[PDB]
Design a protein around this ligand. Structure first.
Ligand SMILES: [Mg+2]
Lengths: 97, 106, 87, 95, 95, 106, 82, 97
DNA sequence: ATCAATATCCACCTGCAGATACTACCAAAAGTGTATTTGGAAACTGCTCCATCAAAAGGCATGTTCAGCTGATTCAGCTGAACATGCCTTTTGATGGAGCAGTTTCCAAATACACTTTTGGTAGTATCTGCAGGTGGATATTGAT
DNA sequence: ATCAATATCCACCTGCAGATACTACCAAAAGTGTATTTGGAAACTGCTCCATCAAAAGGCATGTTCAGCTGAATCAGCTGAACATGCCTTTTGATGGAGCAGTTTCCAAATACACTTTTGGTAGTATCTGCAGGTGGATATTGAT
C-alpha cells in the first residue's frame, strides 16, 4: 500500500491552491455565520447575495494574507509549523492590536 | 461640435469627469483644465493595467482578461502593487510563492 | 410570518479542511492543531467589525436589506478596499 | 428604470488600442470600473485638501498635478504627469 | 498679523470646568487643538460620505450621529451620541 | 442677542463649527442642528481627555498639564488609545513597559 | 575629519531610541540597519513635504508642509499646527 | 574597583528613557541629514525651525515603536538580542516591505 | 550571610521661562431680520430579487498509523555590555538679510443661464464564441528497495 | 540506480453561459452661445525668523575585558500528515412575495442677502509663578567575598 511522506501532499496542495482563485470556504456555512453575526447586531435583516459574496471575498483574502504573515513569524522562530503565537505576533505587529 | 475629449485627444470622457468634480464637493470652483488633466491620468493608468493584464492573459493561453489576470498584472508590477497595496481584487487569488525552507531534502 | 430557525454555533461551519485550504493558499506547509480555533476566533472579530459598519450604513439608509454597497463602504472605512462588487 | 453610468465603454476602447484581439469578462470590467472610480476619488481628494491648505477655492490642473505626484509612485507619477500636461496643452490650443 | 483661529479658549474653559485648579502648557494646548481639528475632520468627512451615499444634499445631525457611531469605540460613541442629542434638545426648546 | 453655544449649553463655539462645516466642502447644505451636535461631541471628547490628563498631572505631583500627561492619559485608556491608534503626541514618550523575559533572574 | 551625515546618527543615539523602545540587548549590525530605515522614512516624508512647498511656491519647508505630509503617510502628528 | 553586570545598566537606561520625553538624537546632525535628503528633491531649500522639529519628533516616535515590534520579533525567536532580521520581519509584517 | 560602592529617593530652595491677567482696538465673525429657493418625506405602486423550498451532487468526519518536527538539554565560543575622559562636535546665543506674508489691484477665466444638439445607457430580440469540464492517453514525480 | 504507484500534463471535444451584436428610442447628458461676477496672479515691501558663526558647553569615540548570550548538536517524545472508510450537507434549479426603488406631488427648512452688534485674537505692556535644577542627607540596590 502506497504512502506519500508527510509534507509532500502539503506542498502539492500549496501549488494547487496558489494556482486557482475559487473561494475556499463552502458558501452556505459562510452565509449562516454572516446571518448569525448580523442578527446579533440587528434583527430582521435581509442580505443581497452579492453582499454575502463581498464579505466572503474580503474575509478569505484577509485570512490568506494573515496566514502568509503567520508563516513568516513561524519561520523566524526556525519552525515550519504555524502556531497561535505566530498569528498573535502577526496581528500585534499589524496593529490589529 | 467637437467633444472636449477629442479636443484633448482622449478616449476618456472629459465631460463626465468635469461633472463628477462638481457634484463631488471638492472645492467651490473647478478649473477647465482640471477634468482634462484628470481624465488623461485616468486613461493612462487604465492603459498601463490593461497592457499588463493582457499579457498575463496571453501567457495563460487565454483571449479574455479575467480577474486573475488583473491580479497577476498588479502584483507582478512594483508600482501598481504599491498603488493598490491596500486593495483587494475579488477572484484574483495570490502569486505562487513558497518559502525556501519549506522545500524538501536540502 | 410563521417561525424562523435559531442560528447558533455557525462558526463551526468554518471547518478544519476549509481553514487548511486557506493556509495552503497563504503558503503554509504545517499546521498545529490549535490553529483552527484561533482562526475561527480571528475570523469572527473580522466579520463583527465589518458587519457592524455595514449594518450601520444599512440603518442610516433606512433599509432592511444589507447591500453589496453597504459592505463595500464598510470595507473601505477599515482600509480593506474591495474591487469587484460595484465599489 | 434609472441610468447607471460606468467607465466600461472607455475601458473597452483603451483595451482595443493596446490588445486588439483580447476581450474582458464582465467581472474584470467591474474591477476596472472600480479601479477608475477609486483613483478618481483619491486624486480629487488630495486636490481638494491641497486647495484648502493654500486658501484656494478652485481646483485647477495644477492642483491635480500635485495630487498625482503625491498619490502615484515614482515612475507612474512621472508618466501620468506628462500625459496630463500633454492633454491640457493640446486642449488649450484646440478651441 | 492675519487672524490665527484656535480652539484654545474653549479648551481652557472646559479644563476649568473639569479641573479648576489645573493649568496647561502651550505645547499641550497645541496638541489639544490638533486633536479637536483632527476629530472634526474625521467626523465631518464621514458625514459627507453618508450624505453622498444616500443621494442627500444636506449634512444633518443624523449624519453626524451615524458618523460618530462609525468612528468612536463603543463607550466613547455612546456618550458622544447622548451629549450630542442632549445639546440638540436644549437648543430646540430655547427661544 | 444670545449665542448658539449658550443656547445649546456648550462651551464649544456652535457658530464657528457651523461656519467651518459650510466652507469645508462637506455637502451643498448644512442642517441647523448638525453644528450643535458636532460641537457637543467635540467638547465631550475634550473633557474626557482633559479629565484623564488632569489626573495624570495630579499623580505626578503637578498642576500644569504637559504633553507627557496627555500621552499617559491616552495610552492608559483602551478607547482613547484606539481612537488615537495612528496618532503621535509630540513630546509624549512611551508607557513604562519591559518584557518579563528581559527581567534579571531573581 | 570628514564624516557622512547619516553617521551623525550615532550608536549611542540609536541605543537610546532602542532603550525607550524597551530593548535590552543590541546586535552590532543594528546601527547600520536603523540608519537605512530612518533614511527611507525621511525620504518618503520629506519628498511629500517638499512637494507641498513647491505647490505653494515657497523656498521654505514649513511645519505645516511637514504635518500634512505625515498625515497623508498615515503618521498624524499633533503639536505643530493643523 | 566596581563593575555592573551586562544588562544591569541597559535595564537602568530603559527605565530612564521610558520616563522621559526629550529627543534622543542630537539636533544638529539630524538637521544636516534632513537637509541632505531634501536637496535631492529641491535645491536651495530653507527650513522653518519647527519644520525640522516636527520631522524629528515623527522620526523618533517611528523608530521607538519599530524597536518595540523588533523586540517582540527577537523574543518570538527566543532571543533577547535584536538583530536586523527582527527589524526586517517587523517591517515586512507592517507592510513597509 | 557582611560590606562597601554608588544609584536613587525625597525635602527644601529659588530664578526665570513661560504662563497669565488687562487694557484699547479694530476687522472680522456671529447674530438678527426679510425675501427666496428647494430638498426630501410621504404617499402610491411597478417589479426586481430575496427567502424559501425539493432534488440532485460531492466534500466532510473519523480512526489509525508513524514520520519527522519541536522543544529540551548541554556546551563552547563569539560578541556585545561595561568601562573612563579629553578631543572635538554640538549647543548657545548674537546679528545681518532673505523671503514669507499682508495689501491692493485688475482681468482671464470662473459661474450662470437658456435653447440645441448628441449620446450613453437599456431593452427587447437575435446569432456568436471562448473556454470550462469531460475524456483518454502519453510523460513526470515520488518513494520503496 | 530500477521498478511501480499515482499525480500531472496536454490534446482534443461537445455544450453552453456568458459575451458580443443591431435596431430603435430617449432622457439626460454635453455642447453651444451669450451675459455677469470674481479668484488669484502679479507687483511692491515690511519685518519676522532663518543661516551663519564665536564662544561656550559637555557627549561621545575609543580598546580592553570577559559575562553571558546565541546557535550548533543531539535526541526522546509525541503531534500532525496521510489515507482509508462511511455517509451527511451543500449545491443547484425552481417559485410565490417583501421591499426596494421610481415617479410626483407639496411644505418646512435652508440659502441669500444686508444690516447691527459682538467677540476672539493680537499686541503692547506689565505681572505673576510652577517647577527644573541644585543641594544635602538618608536609604536602597547591586555586586563582591
Ligand atoms: Mg443570536
Amino acid at each position: 500500500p502506497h504512502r506519500y511522506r508527510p509534507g509532500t501532499v502539503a506542498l502539492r496542495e500549496i501549488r494547487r491552491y496558489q494556482k486557482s482563485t475559487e473561494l475556499l470556504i463552502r458558501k452556505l456555512p459562510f452565509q449562516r455565520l454572516v446571518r448569525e453575526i448580523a442578527q446579533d447586531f440587528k434583527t430582521d435583516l435581509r442580505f443581497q447575495s452579492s453582499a454575502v459574496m463581498a464579505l466572503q471575498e474580503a474575509s478569505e483574502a484577509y485570512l490568506v494574507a494573515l496566514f502568509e504573515d503567520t508563516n513568516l513569524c513561524a519561520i523566524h522562530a526556525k519552525r515550519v509549523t504555524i502556531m497561535p503565537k505566530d498569528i498573535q505576533l502577526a496581528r500585534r505587529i499589524r496593529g490589529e492590536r | 461640435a467637437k467633444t472636449r475629449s477629442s479636443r484633448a485627444g482622449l478616449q476618456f470622457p472629459v465631460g463626465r469627469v468635469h461633472r463628477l468634480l462638481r457634484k463631488g464637493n471638492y472645492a467651490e470652483r473647478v478649473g477647465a483644465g482640471a477634468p482634462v488633466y484628470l481624465a488623461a491620468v485616468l486613461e493612462y493608468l487604465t492603459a498601463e493595467i490593461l497592457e499588463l493584464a493582457g499579457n498575463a492573459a496571453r501567457d495563460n493561453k487565454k483571449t479574455r482578461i479575467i480577474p486573475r489576470h488583473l491580479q497577476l498584472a498588479v502584483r507582478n508590477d512594483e508600482e501598481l502593487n504599491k498603488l493598490l497595496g491596500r486593495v483587494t481584487i475579488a477572484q484574483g487569488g495570490v502569486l505562487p510563492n513558497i518559502q525556501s525552507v519549506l522545500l524538501p531534502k536540502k | 410570518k410563521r417561525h424562523r430557525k435559531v442560528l447558533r454555533d455557525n462558526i463551526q461551519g468554518i471547518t478544519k479542511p476549509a481553514i487548511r485550504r486557506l493556509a495552503r493558499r497563504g503558503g503554509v506547509k504545517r499546521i498545529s492543531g490549535l490553529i483552527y480555533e484561533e482562526t475561527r476566533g480571528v475570523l469572527k472579530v473580522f466579520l463583527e467589525n465589518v458587519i457592524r459598519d455595514a449594518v450601520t450604513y444599512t440603518e442610516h439608509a433606512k433599509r432592511k436589506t444589507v447591500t453589496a454597497m453597504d459592505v463595500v463602504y464598510a470595507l473601505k472605512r477599515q482600509g480593506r478596499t474591495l474591487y469587484g462588487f460595484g465599489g | 428604470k434609472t441610468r447607471k453610468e460606468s467607465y466600461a465603454i472607455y475601458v473597452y476602447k483603451v483595451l482595443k488600442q493596446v490588445h486588439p484581439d483580447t476581450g474582458i469578462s464582465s467581472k474584470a470590467m467591474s474591477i476596472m470600473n472600480s479601479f477608475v472610480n477609486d483613483v478618481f476619488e483619491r486624486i480629487a481628494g488630495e486636490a481638494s485638501r491641497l486647495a484648502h491648505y493654500n486658501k484656494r477655492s478652485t481646483i485647477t490642473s495644477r492642483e491635480i498635478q500635485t495630487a498625482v505626484r503625491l498619490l502615484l509612485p515614482g515612475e507612474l507619477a512621472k508618466h501620468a504627469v506628462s500625459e496630463g500636461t500633454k492633454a491640457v496643452t493640446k486642449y488649450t490650443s484646440a478651441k
